[PDB]
Amino acid sequence: GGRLSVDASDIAEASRDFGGVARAEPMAVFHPRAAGDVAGLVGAAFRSARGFRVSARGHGHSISGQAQAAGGVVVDMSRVARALPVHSAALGGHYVDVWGGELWVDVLNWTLSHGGLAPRSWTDYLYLSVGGTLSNAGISGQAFHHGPQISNVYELDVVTGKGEVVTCSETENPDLFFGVLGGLGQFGIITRARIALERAPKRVRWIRALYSNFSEFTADQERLISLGRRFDYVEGFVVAAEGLSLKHHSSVLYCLEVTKNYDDETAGSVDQDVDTLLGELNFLPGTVFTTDLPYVDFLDRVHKAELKLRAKGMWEVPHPWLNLFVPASRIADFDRGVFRGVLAGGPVLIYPMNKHKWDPRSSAVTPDEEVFYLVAFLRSALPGAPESLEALARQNQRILDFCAGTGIGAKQYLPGHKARHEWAEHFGAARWDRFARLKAEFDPRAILAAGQGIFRP
Ligand SMILES: *Cc1cc2c(cc1C)nc1c(=O)[nH]c(=O)nc-1n2C[C@H](O)[C@H](O)[C@H](O)COP(=O)(O)OP(=O)(O)OC[C@H]1O[C@@H](n2cnc3c(N)ncnc32)[C@H](O)[C@@H]1O
Ligand SMILES: Cc1ccn(-c2ncnc3[nH]cnc23)c1
Mark out the alpha helices in 354-419 (DSSP H runs).
386-405
The response to whether residue 122 sits with its C-beta less than 6 Å from ligand 2 reads no
Run of H or E including 190: strand 189-199
Q: Which residues, at least 6 apart from 181, have a Cβ–Cβ distance to it below 8 Å?
A: 134, 150, 153, 359, 362, 363, 364
Work out the number of other CB atoms within 10 angstroms of the CB of residue 329: 14
Per-residue DSSP letter, 448: B
Determination approach: X-ray
Catalytic residue IDs:
61, 124, 235
Find out whether 272 and 278 touch, Cβ atoms under 8 Å. no
Residue of 53, 98, 62, 54 whose CA lies nearest to 78: 98
The answer to whether the annotation marks 195 as part of a ligand binding site is no
- Residues 190-209: b if buried by 16+ CB within 10 A, e if exposed: bbbbbbbbeebbbbbbbbbb
Q: Which residues, at least 6 apart from 92, have a Cβ–Cβ distance to it below 8 Å?
A: none
Question: Both 41 and 151 in a single domain?
Answer: no
Question: Both 179 and 250 in a single domain?
Answer: no
Looking at ligand 2, which atom is closest to the CA of residue 124?
Answer: 11
Ligand nearest, relative to CA of residue 314: 2
- d(C-alpha 208, C-alpha 206), whole Å: 7
Mutate to test the pocket of ligand 2, among 349, 350, 392, 413 (most ligand atoms within 8 A of CB): 349
Question: Both 254 and 348 in a single domain?
Answer: yes
The response to whether residue 413 sits with its C-beta less than 6 Å from ligand 2 reads no
Asked if residue 10 belongs to a domain, the reply is yes
Find out whether 69 and 450 touch, Cβ atoms under 8 Å. yes
Phi-psi region of 382 (alpha: psi -120 to 50; beta: other; left: phi over 0): beta
Asked if residue 384 belongs to a domain, the reply is yes
Question: Both 137 and 247 in a single domain?
Answer: no
Asked if residue 418 belongs to a domain, the reply is no
Give me the domain span that covers residue 393.
Answer: 202-413
Tell me which residue has its CA closest to atom 41 in ligand 1: 132
- d(C-alpha 26, C-alpha 33), whole Å: 20
The response to whether residue 26 sits with its C-beta less than 6 Å from ligand 1 reads no
Looking at ligand 1, which atom is closest to the CA of residue 413?
Answer: 15
CA distances from 255 to 124, 261, 431 (A): 16, 20, 36
Question: Both 257 and 123 in a single domain?
Answer: no
CA distances from 424 to 10, 116, 362, 418, 420 (A): 35, 44, 17, 11, 6
Q: How many residues does the chain have?
A: 457
Asked if residue 97 belongs to a domain, the reply is yes
- d(C-alpha 303, C-alpha 125), whole Å: 7
CATH of the domain at 87: 3.30.465.10
- d(C-alpha 352, C-alpha 143), whole Å: 9
Amino acid at site 131: G
The dihedral of CA 353, 94, 59, 384: what is its sign? Answer: negative
Choose one of 170, 201, 232: the last residue of a domain: 201
Run of H or E including 426: helix 420-427
Phi, psi of 5 (to 5 degrees): -125, 140
Ligand 1 centre to CA of 179 (Å) is 17
Question: Both 178 and 252 in a single domain?
Answer: no
Question: Both 252 and 265 in a single domain?
Answer: yes
- Residues 57-94: b if buried by 16+ CB within 10 A, e if exposed: bbbbbbbbbbbbbbebbbbbbeeeebeebeeeeeeebb
Cα angle value 156/439/195 (rounded, 5°)? 15
Run of H or E including 272: helix 270-279
Strand 153-159 versus strand 117-118 pairing type: unpaired
Tell me which residue has its CA closest to atom 1 in ligand 1: 61
Work out the number of other CB atoms within 10 angstroms of the CB of residue 151: 19
Find out whether 413 and 358 touch, Cβ atoms under 8 Å. no
Strand 73-76 versus strand 28-31 pairing type: parallel
